[PDB]
Amino acid sequence: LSTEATAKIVSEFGRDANDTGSTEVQVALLTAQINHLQGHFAEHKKDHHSRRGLLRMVSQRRKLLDYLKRKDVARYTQLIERLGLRR
RNA sequence: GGGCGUUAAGUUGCAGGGUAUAGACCCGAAACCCGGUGAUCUAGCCAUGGGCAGGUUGAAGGUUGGGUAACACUAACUGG
Ligand SMILES: [Mg+2]
Ligand SMILES: [Mg+2]
Structure with missing residues (x-):
């Protein structure tokens, strides 16, 4: 993912806005990439090695x-x- | 020599027998051809209107709930 987007993510979820390793931060980075990559797996459907x-x-x-x-x-x-997320 | 001929009356009417072509002693076909009349029944089509009481199961879907990274998948209701 792009450096400005991950800097946005750690700024919007960060503990000290530097740490980049907190659990909220890792879940935010994961969910950003998942909801970005669903668009890839809607147009390419046979892409199993990235699925x-x-x-x-x-x-x-x-x-x-x-x-x-x-x-907590x-x-x-x-x-x-x-x-x-739903559950 | 033989074949055919010679010495023997025909012709025009009328009546009659027969013949010929005409329908040809009468009645009788299935049929063939030419010209028309019919789609107010029936076959199909076109245009335009009408009709089908009642009572059943309850498909596609649509909500909602769950489930899925998201669908797919699933239960309840609505649906007709
Ligand atoms: Mg990784
Ligand atoms: Mg007529």
Whole structure:
């Protein structure tokens, strides 16, 4: 992804606006790339070698978001509402 | 020599028998051809109007809920 977009992402979700490694930040970067890449997998439908990378991104987002749900329930609920994931 | 001939009355009427061509002693076909009349029944078509009580199951979809990274997928209701 582009450097201005990731700088936007860490500025809108960051702890100290430098850290780039927090769980909210990693889920925000993952969801930005997933909702950008759905447009690729709507026009190219036989693109399985990148569809696997999308499935990796999905599973990794789900692992981080489950760790957030175990860690802070209030932070997880406000984060899933701020992003716009369903569950 | 043989074949055909010679010495033997025809012709015009009228009546009659027969013949010929005409329908030819009468009645009787399926049929063929030429010219018209018919699509007020029926076959199809075109244009234009009309008719089909009632009562059933309940397809496509559409909402909502769940599910899916998003669909696909699924239950409830609506649908007709
Ligand atoms: Mg990665
Ligand atoms: Mg007529």
